[PDB]
Design an enzyme around this catalytic site. Sequence first.
Site, short mmCIF file in Angstrom:
data_model
loop_
_atom_site.label_atom_id
_atom_site.label_comp_id
_atom_site.label_asym_id
_atom_site.label_seq_id
_atom_site.Cartn_x
_atom_site.Cartn_y
_atom_site.Cartn_z
N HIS A 75 79.46 -53.46 148.13
CA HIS A 75 79.23 -53.97 146.76
C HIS A 75 80.19 -55.06 146.38
CE1 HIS A 75 77.02 -50.12 146.48
NE2 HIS A 75 76.16 -50.92 145.87
N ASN A 76 79.90 -56.22 146.95
CA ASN A 76 80.82 -57.35 146.97
C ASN A 76 80.10 -58.66 146.68
OD1 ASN A 76 79.74 -58.29 149.51
ND2 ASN A 76 80.96 -56.71 150.55
N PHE A 77 80.83 -59.77 146.70
CA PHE A 77 80.25 -61.05 146.36
C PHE A 77 79.10 -61.42 147.27
CE2 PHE A 77 80.10 -65.74 146.67
CZ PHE A 77 79.51 -65.90 145.38
N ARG A 78 79.28 -61.14 148.56
CA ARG A 78 78.25 -61.48 149.52
C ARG A 78 76.98 -60.68 149.22
NH1 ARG A 78 79.12 -64.29 154.18
NH2 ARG A 78 81.23 -63.53 154.12
N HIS A 79 77.10 -59.46 148.69
CA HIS A 79 75.93 -58.73 148.34
C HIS A 79 75.23 -59.40 147.15
CE1 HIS A 79 73.17 -55.65 147.08
NE2 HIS A 79 73.81 -55.51 145.93
N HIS A 115 74.55 -58.57 138.80
CA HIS A 115 74.08 -57.23 138.63
C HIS A 115 75.03 -56.14 139.18
CE1 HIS A 115 73.09 -57.31 142.90
NE2 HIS A 115 73.12 -56.00 142.79
N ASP A 225 67.49 -56.44 145.20
CA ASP A 225 68.72 -55.69 145.34
C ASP A 225 68.70 -54.91 146.63
OD1 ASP A 225 71.31 -54.49 144.62
OD2 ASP A 225 70.39 -53.20 143.18
N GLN A 276 68.36 -45.21 157.22
CA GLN A 276 67.37 -46.22 156.96
C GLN A 276 65.90 -45.78 157.11
OE1 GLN A 276 69.71 -47.55 155.47
NE2 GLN A 276 69.21 -49.70 155.99
N1 LIG Z 1 69.96 -46.12 152.81
C1 LIG Z 1 70.02 -47.32 152.24
N2 LIG Z 1 70.27 -47.38 150.93
C2 LIG Z 1 70.33 -48.62 150.37
C3 LIG Z 1 70.13 -49.74 151.17
N3 LIG Z 1 70.22 -50.82 150.41
C4 LIG Z 1 70.50 -50.39 149.16
N4 LIG Z 1 70.55 -49.06 149.14
C5 LIG Z 1 70.90 -48.26 147.94
O1 LIG Z 1 70.33 -48.83 146.77
C6 LIG Z 1 71.31 -49.04 145.73
C7 LIG Z 1 70.87 -50.18 144.80
O2 LIG Z 1 71.88 -50.75 143.93
P1 LIG Z 1 73.51 -51.01 144.41
O3 LIG Z 1 73.24 -52.41 145.11
O4 LIG Z 1 74.18 -50.75 143.04
O5 LIG Z 1 73.70 -49.52 145.66
C8 LIG Z 1 72.56 -49.37 146.55
C9 LIG Z 1 72.43 -48.38 147.68
O6 LIG Z 1 72.95 -47.15 147.25
C10 LIG Z 1 69.87 -49.59 152.51
O7 LIG Z 1 69.65 -50.56 153.21
N5 LIG Z 1 69.84 -48.39 153.02
MG LIG Z 2 74.13 -51.81 141.60
MN LIG Z 3 73.47 -54.41 144.20
#
Ligand SMILES: Nc1nc2c(ncn2[C@@H]2O[C@@H]3COP(=O)(O)O[C@H]3[C@H]2O)c(=O)[nH]1
Ligand SMILES: [Mg+2]
Ligand SMILES: [Mn+2]
Length: 328
Positions: A75-79, A115, A225, A276
């Site tokens: 949960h970082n800038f790249r995300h 977000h 997201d 996944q």
């Molecule tokens: N298992 C799994 N969960 C994901 C994946 N991508 C997002 N999520 C979940 O979806 C959530 C969506 O919002 P955040 O980006 O706050 O935290 C994220 C993760 O908990 C993924 O590729 N695999």
């Molecule tokens: Mg989020």
């Molecule tokens: Mn996110």
Amino acid sequence: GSHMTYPKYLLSPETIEALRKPTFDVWLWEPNEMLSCLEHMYHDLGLVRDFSINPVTLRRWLFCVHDNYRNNPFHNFRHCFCVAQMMYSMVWLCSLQEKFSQTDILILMTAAICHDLDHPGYNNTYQINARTELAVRYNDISPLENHHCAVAFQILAEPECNIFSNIPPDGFKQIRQGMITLILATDMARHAEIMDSFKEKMENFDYSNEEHMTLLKMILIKCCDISNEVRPMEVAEPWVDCLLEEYFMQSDREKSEGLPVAPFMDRDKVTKATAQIGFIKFVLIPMFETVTKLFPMVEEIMLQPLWESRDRYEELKRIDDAMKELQK
Ligand SMILES: Nc1nc2c(ncn2[C@@H]2O[C@@H]3COP(=O)(O)O[C@H]3[C@H]2O)c(=O)[nH]1
Ligand SMILES: [Mg+2]
Ligand SMILES: [Mn+2]
């Protein structure tokens, strides 16, 4: 085909073109290159033009957003760059500009960028169960998400970062409301609720009905997201180890502090594959199946990679399992 080398933050023509597609390698680039990309998005979507965004403020604001993301594994800038870049991809893939106003695009894009502001790398369940200051502050209601949103508007309230300084107040109020709905919509606790509301509208979708549009915008931001797995396998995969890195940090802590551990963050029981397969089969495939009813080109560009990714993880698990049968 260029006569000399440019610094990196001068994006090349190749990069700019590649930025429009979800095949983009979100790992190739350092933060300043990603900032220039987000910048280009605002100009290219006509948002600078149509909202009189002072272009130095656009830069200052992005650098500021950047500063307020933390160095978490996931949960970082790249995300946030991924989420924004996928939204950008989607504007082109679905011709969102035909159906949406520029105000709606501004919302989608600014909400994508903001977000997950200041995410501490432990989820809402940790906050609630630990009775963190955030959980107390937001009364157990989508605390992370409400916080990301508040940080978004604190940044925008600093005048040197205020990309909306030239929007009239009715405009500001409208963008603010949208962004709040969209960022709050990203809390996965609400996933089935939002998906149900959407599907109900999808019985007779109506692009001129604001409520239908709000739900579409919430589904769009939700797709973006959780879209890592839509990307090429070499780009997607490293994200899963980051996600597990956070999930295992959280459950260590939970164990250590007497708090409930979630079995899907349980180190002893969780695997990339096991993470996944379910998330693809029962969250991503179905969400994108419904988006696809409105946008059928979504099937080929986005449902295909997901089908391929599910099939690969299913293979992987078969071998991981074989492999723990040499152990124990
Ligand atoms: N298992 C799994 N969960 C994901 C994946 N991508 C997002 N999520 C979940 O979806 C959530 C969506 O919002 P955040 O980006 O706050 O935290 C994220 C993760 O908990 C993924 O590729 N695999
Ligand atoms: Mg989020
Ligand atoms: Mn996110």
